[PDB]
């Protein structure tokens, strides 16, 4: 049961690549559109999500459009996925980047991150409209795997 | 809008993720596909390719909790590796080539992903959101990998 403003997912507001007429639902039930135009999204929500009040769109399962978001680059965390059902992820200090999270124990990543519009999640923001479940981040006593080389937990990518 | 011939080529094989997935083809139609046990019933009208295929078009309109896992035995396959560039995959055994790419000196990680991280696989479509494929190149530019550089046609250096 959805439930005005408590159900509510944490939406992007933000610079779009792609213009058009996006569609999402809100987990309160909510139907939420995005009018596109020139990188920027107008809004158009009830007045029981959340979303409408903070000017968001909540990026899901349920989202349509030919749109998709170009996140800012000061971001300070976020989740990559590694694998089919892994993610590791990414604190970013300065220019430099540092898995301190992971899914799963020996969790193979590629050498160096990509830009930020491939990551699943930013600052607690959905980016993708497909994304598996995250499973509890480990962050501590754990490695992740680059080809050969094993890195401890907190380690920055080996290219960079 | 036209029915057969408008129509996306769709997708058929293991979802993971059970449940309901909703798209509309370029045709018009709208399809359901009901994912139970990683397979998946189409409902779709006799008016698209792929109701009479029984295949799923991905694409920008698609909804529902599912995704493709397609088998690791594709031949080609669409790889975005930059927010609008992509690079052609070809398999060859357990070996893969880049044969084309969208524009010359593209970077590429140095492993192929598992194939549901391709954005389409011989043909068919397997993401929601897709910048369009400019068109792509195969002779005469190079692809990076890190700080070396190959050739259109070689293949990946992780292999
Ligand atoms: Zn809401
Ligand atoms: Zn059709």
């Known amino acids: 049961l959805g439930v005005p403003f408590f159900s509510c997912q944490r939406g992007y507001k933000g610079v779009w690549r792609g213009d058009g007429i996006m569609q999402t639902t809100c ?12 990188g920027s999204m107008r809004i158009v929500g009830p007045r029981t999500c959340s979303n409408t009040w903070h000017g968001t769109f909540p990026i899901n399962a349920y989202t349509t459009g030919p749109c998709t978001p170009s996140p800012a680059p000061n971001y300070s965390r976020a989740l990559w996925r590694v694998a089919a059902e892994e993610y590791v992820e990414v ?4 220019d430099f980047h540092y898995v301190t999270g992971m899914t799963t124990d020996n969790v193979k990543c590629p050498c160096q991150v990509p830009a930020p519009e ?8 959905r980016l993708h409209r497909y ?3 995250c499973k509890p981040l480990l962050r501590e006593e754990v490695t992740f795997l680059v080809g050969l ?3 401890l937990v907190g380690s920055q990518l080996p290219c960079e």
């Open 131 to 133: 994304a598996p479940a």
């Open 118 to 125: 491939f990551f699943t999640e930013v600052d607690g923001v």
């Open 149 to 151: 080389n094993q890195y």
């Open 91 to 94: 604190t970013r200090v300065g």
């Open 27 to 38: 987990p309160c039930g909510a139907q939420i559109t995005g009018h596109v135009k020139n």
